[PDB]
Amino acid sequence: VDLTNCDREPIHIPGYIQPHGCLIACDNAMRMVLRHSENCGELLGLEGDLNGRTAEDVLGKRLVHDLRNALTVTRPAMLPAMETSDGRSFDISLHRYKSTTIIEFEPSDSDTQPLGTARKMVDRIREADSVESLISRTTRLVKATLGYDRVLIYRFEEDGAGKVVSEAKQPELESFLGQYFPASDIPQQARALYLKNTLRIISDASGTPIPVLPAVDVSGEPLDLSYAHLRNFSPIHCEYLRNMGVAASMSISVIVDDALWGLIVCHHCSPRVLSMPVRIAAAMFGEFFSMFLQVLKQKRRLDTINHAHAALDRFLRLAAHRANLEELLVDSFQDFARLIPCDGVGLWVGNNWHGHGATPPHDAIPRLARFVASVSEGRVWATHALSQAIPEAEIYADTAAGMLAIPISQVKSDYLLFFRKEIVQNLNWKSYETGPMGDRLTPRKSFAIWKESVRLQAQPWSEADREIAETARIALVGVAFHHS
C-alpha cells in the first residue's frame, strides 16, 4: 500500500481485526463456523481450530437459540452481557452481509444505561437555535461526556476537502480549528463505508492486529467486514494517527439529506475502548445531531431567501418612485452586497464602471464585461476560478478570484458583478515526527497540499447564492422593461 492513487485500497476486506475483541463468521443460516479470528481461543477459552465445527458445538445450543432468534428481526443487532456455555460474560455485535453471519465478542460492561446517557446529551442540543450554536456546544458536550482528549467536527466542502469547524481539546494539545485538509486524506471507499457504518473506533493505533482464518476461502473470496466494528483500519491512517501522537479514535457519521455532511471525530493520546452500551448512546446522539442540523440548515436557507425577497421588494418600491432607473442603480448597487456574501460588488451600466469593496482594477473591467457578455446568454454566470476563464485575471486574484454576474437588462449588455477574494486570503488559522512512509502523513503537509489545490480560487457560489442571483435577475430585468 503506497500513497499515490488513494481511492484504490480495499479497506473493507483487510482480513484482520483489532485486539479488543474476537470475531466468528458462520454460513447464511448460522449452521457451522467458516472463519474465525486467531484470538478466538484466548478470549472464549476454546482450544484448537474452530473452522468446520458446527455453531451448536462451539458456543452451545443455549446461546445459538438466542443469536438465531435475533437475526430474525443489514443494521447490526447488539446483544449485551450474554452468557456463554463456559459461564463467561460477553457483549455480542451480530450482523449478516453477503449471506455471511458475523458474530463479534467483547468483554462485558453491565454498569451503564444507554438511553439515560443519550437523553441527557440530546436534551442539551435539542434547543440550539442556529448551526453555529449546535456545532460549538456539541464538541464541548461530547468531550465532557466521553472524556476524549480532543473532539473535532470535520465538515466536507463541495470539492471533497474537509474543514475543522469546531474543536474541544486539552490545553496542552495544538489546535486544528479553521484548518482545511485535501479530499484525498479521506478516500472515496472510506466515505462509502462511513455512509453505511455510522460509528467507528480504533482502540490502539499501535496495537498488534489479529488475523482472520482463513483470510481467503475455497472460492477465492475475502471476508467483507463493512458492518463489523472490529474491522482493522488502513495502516496509512494508523501511521497518520501515530505521527499526530493519537493512540485511539472514535468517529460519528453526520448524515444530512441522505449525504455525508461530515464527521464528529474524537482523538485520545492513550489507548481507549468504548463499551457497547456507551457506543449505543453515542450512536443515538449522532442520529439526533444529524436530524437537528438538517432542520437548522433548512431554517437558515429559508431565512436567507426570505431576507433577499424583502430586500428586492424594498428596491422595487423605490424604482416605481424614481424616473431615472440608471441613477437609482448607481446610488444603490453596493446595497445588493447584503443579498449574496461577497468581498466586493460592481455595476457595469452604459459602458461605465462603478466599484465597491474588493473588485478587479478599473482598466481590467471592460475585458471582463466583454467576456461575460459572450458566455452569459442572458442567464446568471458564476465561476470560483476566474483565471481558468481569463488567464490575465491571475494578476488580481488576491483581490477578486471569483465572480458571479447578473444581467440587469433584457436588451442592453448591463451587469451587476459580485466578486470574492481567493480563499487563502480569508484564512483564520508545530513539528511532527514521521514514520516509514514519509512526512505526507502529517497535518502540516496535508494543509500545505490543500493551500496549493485552492491557489487563485475563491469560496464557491452555493445553490442559495445562485437561487438569489436568479430571483434578483428576474426583479431587475422586470423593472428595467417597465422603464425602457
Residue closer to a copy of itself, measured from CB, 172 or 258: 258
Residue selected from 148, 176, 353, 418 as contacting ligand EL5 according to rule CB under 6 A:
176
Q: Which residue has the cell 488502513?
A: 234
Residue selected from 37, 138, 139, 251 as contacting ligand EL5 according to rule CB under 6 A:
251
CB of 282 to a copy of itself, least distance (A): 15
At 250, give phi and psi (nearest 5°). -145, 125
Q: Which positions from 283 through 342 interact with ligand EL5, judged by CB under 6 A?
A: none
CB of 292 to a copy of itself, least distance (A): 7
Q: Roughly what angle, to the nearest 10 degrees, separates helices 114-125 and 276-319?
A: 20
* Euclidean distance between CA atoms 79 and 108, whole angstroms: 10
Residue closer to ligand EL5, measured from CB, 10 or 350: 10
Residue closer to ligand EL5, measured from CB, 11 or 128: 11
**Binding string, residues 136-165; x marks residues near ligand EL5 by CB under 6 A:** ----------------x-x-----------
**Binding string, residues 187-216; x marks residues near ligand EL5 by CB under 6 A:** x--x--x------x----------------
Residue 288, contacted partner among a copy of itself, ligand EL5, none, CB below 5-8 A by kind: a copy of itself
Under the criterion CB under 6 A, does residue 450 sit at the interface with ligand EL5? no
Residue selected from 19, 277, 360, 443 as contacting ligand EL5 according to rule CB under 6 A:
443
Residue 477, contacted partner among ligand EL5, a copy of itself, none, CB below 5-8 A by kind: a copy of itself
Residue 236, contacted partner among ligand EL5, a copy of itself, none, CB below 5-8 A by kind: ligand EL5
Beta bridge partners of 32: 54
Under the criterion CB under 6 A, does residue 348 sit at the interface with ligand EL5? no
Residue 298, contacted partner among a copy of itself, ligand EL5, none, CB below 5-8 A by kind: a copy of itself
Residue closer to a copy of itself, measured from CB, 260 or 305: 305
CA 141, 146, 151, 157 torsion-angle sign: negative
Beta bridge partners of 35: 25
Beta carbons of 279 and 76 less than 8 angstroms apart: no
The region of 55-63, 363-371, 375-383, 437-445 touching ligand EL5 under the rule CB under 6 A is 437-445
Q: How many residues bind ligand EL5 (CB under 6 A)?
A: 28
Residue closer to ligand EL5, measured from CB, 50 or 102: 102
Beta carbons of 367 and 387 less than 8 angstroms apart: no
Q: Which three cell numbers stand for residue 219?
A: 472460492
Residues that bind a copy of itself (CB under 8 A): 115, 118-119, 122-123, 126, 284, 287-288, 291-292, 294-295, 298-299, 302, 305-306, 309, 410, 467, 471, 474-475, 477-478, 481-482, 484
Residue selected from 84, 139, 203, 249 as contacting ligand EL5 according to rule CB under 6 A:
249
Residue 371, contacted partner among a copy of itself, ligand EL5, none, CB below 5-8 A by kind: none
Residue selected from 265, 385, 397, 476 as contacting ligand EL5 according to rule CB under 6 A:
265
Residues 6 or more apart whose Cβ sits within 8 Å of residue 259: none
Residue 240, contacted partner among ligand EL5, a copy of itself, none, CB below 5-8 A by kind: ligand EL5
Burial 199-236 (b: 16+ CB within 10 A, else e): bbbbbbbebebbebbbeeeeeeebbbbbbbbbbbbbbb
DSSP string, 65-112: HHHHHHH---PPEEEEEEEPSSS-EEEEEEEE-SSEEEEEEEE---S-
CB of 144 to ligand EL5, least distance (A): 20
In angstroms, the Cα distances linking 291 to 47, 251, 285 are 47, 17, 10
Under the criterion CB under 6 A, does residue 9 sit at the interface with ligand EL5? yes
Beta bridge partners of 463: none
Residue 472, contacted partner among ligand EL5, a copy of itself, none, CB below 5-8 A by kind: none
Under the criterion CB under 6 A, does residue 3 sit at the interface with ligand EL5? yes
Residue closer to a copy of itself, measured from CB, 288 or 371: 288
In angstroms, the Cα distances linking 251 to 174, 177, 229, 282, 340 are 19, 17, 12, 10, 34
* Euclidean distance between CA atoms 35 and 44, whole angstroms: 15
DSSP string, 243-260: HHT--EEEEEEEEETTEE
Under the criterion CB under 6 A, does residue 18 sit at the interface with ligand EL5? no
Under the criterion CB under 6 A, does residue 237 sit at the interface with ligand EL5? yes
Beta carbons of 354 and 347 less than 8 angstroms apart: yes
Q: Which three cell numbers stand for residue 106?
A: 467483547
Beta-strand runs (E) in 170-304: 180-181, 199-202, 210-213, 248-256, 259-268
* Euclidean distance between CA atoms 359 and 380, whole angstroms: 19
* Euclidean distance between CA atoms 72 and 64, whole angstroms: 13
Under the criterion CB under 6 A, does residue 446 sit at the interface with ligand EL5? yes
CB of 34 to a copy of itself, least distance (A): 29
* Euclidean distance between CA atoms 434 and 263, whole angstroms: 25
Nearest to 153 by CA among 261, 252, 241, 263: 263
Q: Which residues bind ligand EL5 (CB under 6 A)?
A: 3, 6, 9, 11, 152, 154, 176, 181, 184-187, 190, 193, 200, 233-234, 236-237, 240, 249, 251, 263, 265, 440-441, 443, 446
